[PDB]
Each structure stands twice: as structure tokens, then as C-alpha cells.
Write a protein that binds this ligand. Structure first.
Ligand SMILES: [Mg+2]
Length: 693
RNA sequence: UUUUUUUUUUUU
């Protein structure tokens, strides 16, 4: 007897769809398994309990369910590509010969059966012994077939990624999950490279604008090796300034349809991890020839504006190929120190090649900072949205183990660079959209989804607050009132929920959207925007560089609307996967940090302060702002606790202990919890407990 | 575990 029911016929499925019985939506399987939801955007979402009702479906699988808000899967319309199944292997029947038991890291993926002695590195006689010997080794499996007469599918074990306790092996496994190429560059791509001893041609120096003698700097963080941006300011004889943005001319090295170009389009973006980084381009270009290192002549595209003390564009812009030699390289911290009024030797402490005096650079930094402050105030006043977001910055020891973990605050220098990069991006977008209105690669951000914003508004209604989503400007105004209404940590949580409410930003080809009103950036309130200020780490910036060059030459776009759409979609998906990878890396290093804290301070958990976001059934969702993480204190897992009572309103929960001290805690209350890195389960899992371990 | 929304922007 088949464990699962047969998928209905195509005609029967269509008939049921016209009969209101059948339904169609995406599927989201929950981490705790057995529980899944048919994600229907309009009609109420449906629930699914048990893999029997799941009928051999996976996460993000567009499926056709039938009501049996519960429902049974009867047809799969589309399957999302399962990018590898990394995990571990356990002996058959582990506390007995049989098929090997593969356990994926994603709990959403069911167990897998590895056929009799299926392997190459541990297959043969004594296979069980080899499994046990390599039990603490992460491996990877592929799916081969799922027999309806088996509750689990089957699959071949791939390459052994390696020690689970090895951070780098876990990293390689995570890369494998989201399909990010960690292999070295192909020898043909290296053959595409120019000679390493390439020198600046006098012909090219005359063909371009010679800004070498100018004062140009690169404000980038301390741990930066690929420099793309360069800012400059020019005091004009009147009250105005000529501000310039200079971006490494990668397209001068990367030529269309070359093997280098193909690998760049394949990787789409540079993936940045905590301990290392996967580059999009080979290091010769990414770290030497194109990187805007100090005191080196470099070929770069440049955009100039004429702005007043308020930052309004008074004079005509200028676009063109230039050759520049940056006066100095700066860190964001040192730039902030300069802005705060300190002396160059007290903050930066670097030599400034050229006639440029220290006070010249100081004046330039302060001028650019004031202009950037004015432009940021105007941008937010125009209708933009201010979200600070969260990111976990780690300081590592010589061995790579996390010694420090902290939240990142953006100082005024960060916004200084940010505003001018945004200005450059917007100007380039406007120009290339005006010229090549059919084959232009820009970025868009539509209005937020009504569903998420309604949920967030109801959450604020629970906290007796109203959010006007009628406009981005009203959204930001409600955010400001909220910040002036609650404590800063609650406000941080609210910013988290706000960024959740936003819609996914995406690249696009102007030809696909007939109406120009659809080319808009809701959060930035811009009418035109693209990515152009980072061509060494975002292939869309390479495409935009080529489009800008052609627009200055008034020639053809050289790229087809369809091909442009392909590049846009591929790069959007690659950016999704890269974001996920970086977040998971941060999570991994946070777990290792908690483990090191427990080891050094002779405890089993780290004590932290947390705010109670939700009180449901037998658990409480808590947010730890010190590390910007959302965990759950399971009232059931707390066996040390004696009992509890949740009221029908879920706004307060009373607690009773064995020492008979009863005490009640409500929503948005600040209380202490403990974070511990559970390694007893198969993989790294940060868990939170109310009681100290 | 067994009820769910994880996406603005800069730099890296
Ligand atoms: Mg930079």
C-alpha cells in the first residue's frame, strides 16, 4: 500500500479548481516540521499537518491543495530547485543492518535513505564502522527518487565537507546550500587577464580627464581590500562646490561576452563572510589593478555635480572617463574623528601624497560632511524612509575564533559616503534611462505589501499606536513618532518589523515595464535608481557602466532587452542567496561566541537582557537587542519551572516555581534570559532559556 | 516542535 495518495489528474485538478474545492498557493514548511502552510496571498492561508497530507512536497513548492483550515496536497504545480542537501549521515537504526539515514541541516527537509552501501569514500565492507568514524563529518546528499511506498526519498551521498566543529567546513557547507561558487577561477578567465605589470598609457591619460593632481580619498572600513568609491570636493570661486564621485572603471578590463565576463555574470556579486570573502572577479583585478588604492594612478568613471551649501544641484553635471590618483585612504572611524574636530594626526595618522596639505583634506572632509547631512535631511524630507537595520560585527583572534561581538552603528562618515553614492547612482540611472529607455538596467522597490503592513499596524494597535502607510513619508513620520513614544530597544524591534513590512527590491529592465511610474523606489522615494558605484562586486554595475559609456557615445545599447531581464533576475536571485549566506554566517559566529563565553566564564549560558515580544500558548518570543536576535523561551522546555497561566488576551503570563514564588510578566516587559549554543543536537542552534545554566 | 510573513540604503 502506497504511503501517500496519488496526484490527481490534470483535468481533475482543473475541474476542482473551477469547482472551488481545489486551491493553489505556495507552500512554506516550518522548521519544527510536521507543520506546514499553503501560503495563499488572498484567501486565508491554509494549514497542513503531517507529511501524509504534505504528499511529498518541499519548501517554496507551488502546490494544489484540497480541503479535507486544513488541506491535503493532491498536486504540485511547480517545484523550487533544491540547491543541494547538506547534512549528516547516521547508522541504520542508530540508538541492525539497513539503509543509511541522512539527516539534512534544514529540518524542513525530511530524512533521506542512502541505498545499501551507497558511497565512494566510506562504501564497502565495514561501512557502518566508517560511518561511525566519520559521524561528526558534514556530508552532502542528492535526491534520486521518492517511492510512494516509502515515507522518505532516496539519495546519493556526495563529498565530505568535513568537521562539524570546524568553522570553515560549516562555511563551505553553507556556501554549498545557497549554491555559491567557492572554486578558484578558471585558467581561461586568468588568460583573459591583462599583464600584471600593466602601465598607464599616455594615450589613455590624454583621452580621459586628468584628475590625478586633485584631492581624492576613499573612506572605507578598516577591513577593506577592494576599493570602488572615491569622493572629492572642489572649492569654486563663487559660493558653490564641484563634488565628484569616482568609480573603478572595471569595464575597461572586463569586456563583453569574455570568459571573465561570463564568470562575473555567473557569480553576480561578491559574497562577504565574517572570516573571508568570495570575490566576483579575480584578485588581480579586484585587489590590484581596479581597486582604488592610495598613491596609485587608476582609470575610473567619474560624475561631477555643482552644489551649493545646501546641496542643491546648481550647475550642469559632468560624466566621463578619468584617471585619478587618490590622495589618501581613510577608515570610517578616522573620518568620523576628523568630522568631530580632531587633528589629522590624532585620528587618521596617514601620509598624504601630493601637494595636498593636511588642513586641505580636513576642510574637504568637513565640507563633504555638511553637504551630505543636508542631502540626507532633504532625502528623508522628500519622502524617504529611515531604517537603521542590525548587523553583528565580530573581532576575531589570530586563530579566527570570535573574541568580540557587537552591534554596528553608522557614524556620520557612513552617511557621508552613502548620500554621495546614492546621488551618483540616481544620476547615472536618470541618464541611462533617458538615453536607452528600452535596454536599461535599473533597480526598483514597489510599495510595501498590504498584508505585512496590516499585520504590523495591528501589532501597533495592540501597543496602542497607529502607522500611516498611506505614503512612504507618512510611514517615516509614524516611525519618528514611535521613536519619540517608546524606549530605544522597543524602537529597535519596531524597526525590525518595519523592514519586514517592506517589499523586495529588485533589478529590472526598463523595457519590461511600459509605464515609467512602475520604475520607482518606495523607500528612497526616488523616480530613478540603479546600481553603478560598485562594479567590482556587483555585475549589474558592470552592465550599467557599459550602458553609461554607450550613452556618452550615443551608440547602441549593445545588450538585448531580454538578455538584460535575464541578468536582472539572475542577479536578484543571487543577491537573495548572498544575503541569506551572510546572515547565516553572522549566526554561526554568534553561536561560536556564546560557546566561548560559556567556556571562558565557567558557565553554561550567557546572561543577557531581552524584551518579550509575544506570549503564545506554552512559549514566549523574546528579542535580545544586544545581539539583535529573536529567540523563543519555551515554557514547556523550562522543566525547572513548576507551572504557568496565560490569560485569554495573551498580553500577560503568570509563572509559578517550585519555591512557590509566583510572578507575572506582560508584553514588552524587560527581563533577563540566557543564551546557550546547543551543539547536542546535530547542528549549531542558539537556544534561549529563562533559567541560568 | 506541531501554527507561520523574515525583502530600504551605503560600505565591505
Ligand atoms: Mg568602498
Amino acid at each position: 500500500k502506497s504511503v501517500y495518495p496519488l496526484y490527481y489528474d490534470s483535468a481533475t485538478v482543473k475541474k476542482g479548481l473551477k469547482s472551488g474545492t481545489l486551491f493553489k498557493g505556495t507552500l512554506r514548511i516550518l522548521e519544527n516540521h510536521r507543520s506546514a502552510f499553503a501560503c495563499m496571498e488572498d484567501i486565508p492561508d491554509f494549514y497542513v499537518d503531517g507529511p501524509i497530507a504534505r504528499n511529498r512536497a518541499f519548501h517554496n513548492d507551488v502546490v494544489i491543495v484540497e480541503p479535507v483550515t486544513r488541506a491535503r496536497v493532491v498536486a504540485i504545480e511547480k517545484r523550487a530547485e533544491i540547491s543541494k542537501i547538506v547534512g549528516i549521515l547516521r547508522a541504520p537504526g542508530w540508538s541492525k543492518s539497513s539503509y543509511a539515514i541522512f539527516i539534512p541541516k534544514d529540518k524542513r527537509l525530511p530524512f533521506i535513505t542512502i541505498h545499501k552501501n551507497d558511497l565512494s569514500d566510506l562504501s564497502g565492507e565495514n561501512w557502518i564502522e566508517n560511518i561511525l568514524k566519520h559521524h561528526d563529518q558534514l556530508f552532502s546528499v542528492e535526491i534520486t527518487r521518492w517511492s510512494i511506498y516509502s515515507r522518505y526519498p532516496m539519495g546519493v551521498l556526495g563529498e565530505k565537507l568535513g568537521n562539524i566543529t570546524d568553522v570553515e567546513a560549516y562555511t563551505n557547507a553553507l556556501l554549498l546550500e545557497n549554491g555559491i561558487s567557492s572554486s578558484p577561477f578558471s585558467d581561461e578567465v586568468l588568460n583573459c587577464l591583462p599583464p600584471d605589470d600593466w602601465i598607464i598609457s599616455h594615450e589613455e591619460i590624454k583621452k580621459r580627464r586628468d584628475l590625478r593632481n586633485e584631492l581624492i580619498i576613499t573612506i572605507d572600513p578598516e577591513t577593506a581590500r577592494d576599493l570602488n568609491d572615491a569622493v572629492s570636493c572642489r572649492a569654486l570661486d563663487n559660493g558653490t562646490y564641484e563634488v565628484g564621485v569616482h568609480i573603478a572603471d572595471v569595464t575597461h578590463f572586463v569586456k563583453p561576452d569574455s570568459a571573465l565576463d561570463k564568470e562575473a555574470a555567473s557569480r553576480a556579486t561578491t559574497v562577504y563572510l565574517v572570516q573571508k570573502a568570495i570575490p566576483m572577479l579575480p584578485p588581480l583585478l579586484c585587489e590590484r589593478l581596479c581597486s582604488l588604492n592610495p598613491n596609485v594612478e587608476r582609470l575610473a568613471f567619474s560624475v561631477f555635480w555643482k552644489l551649493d551649501s545646501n546641496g542643491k544641484e546648481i550647475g550642469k553635471r559632468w560624466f566621463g572617463k578619468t584617471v585619478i590618483k587618490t590622495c589618501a585612504r581613510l577608515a570610517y572611524s578616522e573620518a568620523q574623528g576628523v568630522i568631530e574636530g580632531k587633528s589629522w594626526d590624532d585620528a587618521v595618522g596617514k601620509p598624504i601624497g601630493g601637494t595636498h596639505t593636511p588642513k586641505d583634506v580636513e576642510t574637504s572632509i568637513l565640507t563633504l560632511c555638511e553637504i551630505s547631512r543636508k542631502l540626507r535631511k532633504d532625502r528623508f524630507a522628500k519622502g524617504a524612509v529611515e531604517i537603521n537595520s542590525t548587523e553583528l560585527k565580530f573581532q576575531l583572534d589570530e586563530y579566527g575564533m570570535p573574541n568580540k561581538c557587537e552591534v554596528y552603528e553608522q557614524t556620520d562618515a557612513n552617511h557621508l559616503i552613502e548620500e554621495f553614492m546614492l546621488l551618483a547612482n540616481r544620476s547615472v540611472a536618470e541618464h541611462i534611462s533617458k538615453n536607452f529607455s528600452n535596454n536599461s538596467l535599473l533597480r526598483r522597490h514597489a510599495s510595501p505589501k498590504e498584508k505585512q503592513i496590516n499585520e504590523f499596524c495591528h501589532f501597533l494597535k495592540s501597543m496602542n499606536f497607529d502607522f500611516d502607510a498611506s505614503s512612504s513619508a507618512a510611514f517615516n513620520a509614524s516611525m519618528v513618532r514611535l521613536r519619540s513614544t517608546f524606549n530605544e530597544e522597543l524602537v529597535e524591534l519596531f524597526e525590525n518589523m518595519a523592514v519586514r513590512s517592506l517589499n523586495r527590491a529588485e533589478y529590472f529592465c526598463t523595457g519590461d515595464f511600459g509605464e515609467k511610474t512602475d520604475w520607482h523606489h518606495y523607500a528612497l522615494s526616488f523616480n530613478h535608481y540603479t546600481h553603478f558605484t560598485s562594479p567590482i562586486r556587483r555585475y549589474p554595475d558592470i552592465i550599467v557602466h557599459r550602458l553609461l559609456e554607450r550613452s556618452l557615445k550615443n551608440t547602441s545599447p549593445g545588450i538585448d532587452k531580454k538578455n538584460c531581464s535575464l541578468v536582472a533576475a539572475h542577479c536578484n536571485e543571487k543577491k537573495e542567496k548572498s544575503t541569506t549566506v551572510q546572515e547565516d554566517s553572522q549566526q554561526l559566529f554568534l553561536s561560536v561566541y556564546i560557546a566561548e563565553y560559556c567556556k571562558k566564564h565557567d558557565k553554561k549560558s550567557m546572561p543577557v537582557q531581552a524584551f518579550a515580544t509575544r506570549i503564545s500558548g506554552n512559549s514566549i518570543d523574546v528579542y535580545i537587542s544586544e545581539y539583535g536576535i529573536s529567540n523563543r523561551v519555551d515554557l514547556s522546555s523550562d522543566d525547572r519551572i513548576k507551572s504557568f497561566i496565560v490569560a485569554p488576551d495573551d498580553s500577560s503570563v503568570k509563572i509559578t516555581l517550585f519555591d512557590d514564588s509566583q510572578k507575572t510578566i506582560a508584553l514588552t516587559d524587560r527581563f533577563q534570559v540566557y543564551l546557550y549554543s546547543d551543539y547536542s543536537r546535530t547542528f549549531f542552534s542558539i537556544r534561549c532559556s529563562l533559567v541560568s545554566l
